[PDB]
């Protein structure tokens, strides 16, 4: 919103408590609607594209899809966005991709979330979201059943530097802001 890359880096390393204390003090209801989310993070009056991205990001973190990001979804979201353990983030990204929570990531689920968080904008060269998705399965869906187990995910993404970056760093705070002020 209103800060440079160096500022975003410092925030990325800012303690959870600082983020939580500010949220709970400003949102006593323990919830944020999308509008309040924009106000809180200084994300309003963005271009149509950036605004759209902000909306889908909000929806992505709105785990129970009730239209609000509550105190639990807030810290879970920050656990992925802020600096943390790559080892721990692998499982949390998997859970995010597993839309229906059946313990497996199917082609459709991966495609939807990948588009939502614009992960392919991180790539480098021509790569459609549908193309990148089919590539992921072609490369890490070992038994070719159309589903990614946690095992296949962790194993495959850790053996491919490209998959690791695009699939588990798309929500880094610095990458999000860099993505925002770049759509308008
Ligand atoms: C512009 O520079 C805004 C700086 C603050 C970035 C806010 C982006 C927050 C998105 C991830 C956090 C989600 C917490 C539920
Ligand atoms: Ca919610
Ligand atoms: Ca699933
Ligand atoms: Ca499989």
Kindly provide the residue ranges of all beta strands, DSSP E only, lying in the chain, ordered along the sequence.
31-32, 69-70, 105-106, 147-148
Please tell me if the CB atom of residue 20 comes closer than 6 angstroms to any atom of ligand 1: no
Name the residue among 53, 70, 77 with its Cα closest to residue 1. Answer: 53
d(CA 180, CA 70): 23
Resolution of the experimental structure, in angstroms: 2.0
And the tokens for 53? 């991205």
Whether 90 and 157 have beta carbons less than 8 Å apart is answered as yes
CA-CA-CA-CA torsion for 68, 73, 79, 82, nearest 10 degrees?
10
Domains 1-83+171-184 and 84-170 share a fold: yes
Method: X-ray
Ranges of each domain in the chain? 1-83+171-184, 84-170
Q: 101 CA distance to ligand 3 centroid (A)?
A: 5
Cα–Cα distance for residue pair 62/39, rounded to 1 Å: 17
CA nearest 58: which of 42, 38, 76, 44?
38
**Superfamily of domain covering 84-170:** EF-hand (1.10.238.10)
Cα-based torsion angle of the residue sequence 67, 71, 76, 77 in order, rounded to the nearest 10 degrees: 50
Around Cβ 181, how many Cβ atoms within 10 Å? 16
Residues with a beta carbon under 5 angstroms from ion ligand 4 = 141, 143, 145, 147
Q: Is 1-83+171-184 CATH 3.40.50.300?
A: no
């Amino acid at each position: 919103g209103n800060m440079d890359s160096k500022a975003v880096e410092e925030l990325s390393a800012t303690e959870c408590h600082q983020w939580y204390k500010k949220f709970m003090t400003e949102c006593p209801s323990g919830q944020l609607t999308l509008y309040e989310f924009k106000q809180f993070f200084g994300l309003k009056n963005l271009s149509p594209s950036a605004n759209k991205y902000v909306e889908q990001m909000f929806e992505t973190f709105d785990f129970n899809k009730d239209g609000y990001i509550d105190f639990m979804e807030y810290v879970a979201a920050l656990s992925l966005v802020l600096k943390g353990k790559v080892d721990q983030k692998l499982r949390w990204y998997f859970k995010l991709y597993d839309v229906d929570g059946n313990g497996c990531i199917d082609r459709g689920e991966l495609l939807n979330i990948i588009k939502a968080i614009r992960a392919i904008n991180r790539c480098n060269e021509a790569m459609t979201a549908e193309e990148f998705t089919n590539m992921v399965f072609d490369k890490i869906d070992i038994n070719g059943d159309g589903e990614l187990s946690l095992e296949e995910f962790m194993e495959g993404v850790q053996k491919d530097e490209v998959l690791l970056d695009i699939l588990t760093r798309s929500l880094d705070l610095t990458h999000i802001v860099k993505l925002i002020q770049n759509d308008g």
